[PDB]
Amino acid sequence: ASVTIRNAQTGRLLDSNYNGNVYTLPANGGNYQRWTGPGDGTVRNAQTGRCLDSNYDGAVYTLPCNGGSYQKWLFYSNGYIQNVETGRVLDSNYNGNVYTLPANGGNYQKWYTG
Ligand SMILES: OC[C@H]1O[C@H](O[C@H]2[C@@H](O)[C@H](O)[C@@H](CO)O[C@@H]2O)[C@@H](O)[C@@H](O)[C@@H]1O
Ligand SMILES: OC[C@H]1O[C@H](O[C@H]2[C@@H](O)[C@H](O)[C@@H](CO)O[C@@H]2O)[C@@H](O)[C@@H](O)[C@@H]1O
Ligand SMILES: OC[C@H]1O[C@H](O[C@H]2[C@@H](O)[C@H](O)[C@@H](CO)O[C@@H]2O)[C@@H](O)[C@@H](O)[C@@H]1O
């Protein structure tokens, strides 16, 4: 069970690497752009096995999965992807930067996941 996670505004796909950097890039079909959810709230990179993670300041990264609440996420049917600990939502821009912000209703915070 795995998905891609595509930004509604930019079309770029959520992606990450072995350094733990998280960014978006145009779709390339590679496994760094796939993500798996084993049903514990985690979102794990298909290639690196590292968990999507974020902090109260809004930085986004991946780390080996550590069981904490910062690595848990809620996927809403309207496209928000919300961090369970902080309540901020996954967000990104035209340059490929990824971060979290309070929900603002803008399209950069909407994601298509499947
Ligand atoms: O050749 C490595 C890698 O290149 C392409 O993936 C890019 C990006 O999606 C990845 O996050 C980083 C991982 O370091 O590398 C590239 O910038 C894809 O062709 C991918 O399938 C490939 O394995
Ligand atoms: O620092 C306590 C914190 O550590 C671990 O979480 C790490 C990372 O997953 C978090 O995103 C950042 C948030 O600032 O903190 C750590 O680097 C977990 O053990 C977590 O439960 C705990 O609160
Ligand atoms: O007015 C710009 C933009 O502002 C709000 O979006 C913010 C953030 O969610 C976005 O990721 C970045 C993209 O560069 O911009 C802001 O920081 C939203 O109101 C959005 O609709 C709006 O275009």
Curated annotation (Swiss-Prot):
- Repeat sequence: residue ranges? 1-38, 39-76, 77-114
Task: Cite the entry's keywords alphabetically.
Answer: Antiviral protein, Lectin, Repeat, Signal
Outline the segment boundaries, as ranges, of region: 3 X 38 AA tandem repeats: 1-114
Which superkingdom is the protein from?
Answer: Bacteria
Q: What is the effect of changing residue 109 to A?
A: Complete loss of HIV fusion inhibition
Q: Name one GO molecular function term.
A: carbohydrate binding
The Ricin B-type lectin domain sits at 1-114
User: Its quaternary structure?
Assistant: Interacts with HIV gp120 and SIV gp130.
State any further remark: Anti-HIV protein that inhibits virus membrane fusion.
- Its protein name is Actinohivin
Protein species of origin: Actinomycete sp. (strain K97-0003)
Q: Which gene encodes it?
A: ath
Which residues of the complete protein does this chain represent? Answer: 47 to 160 of 160
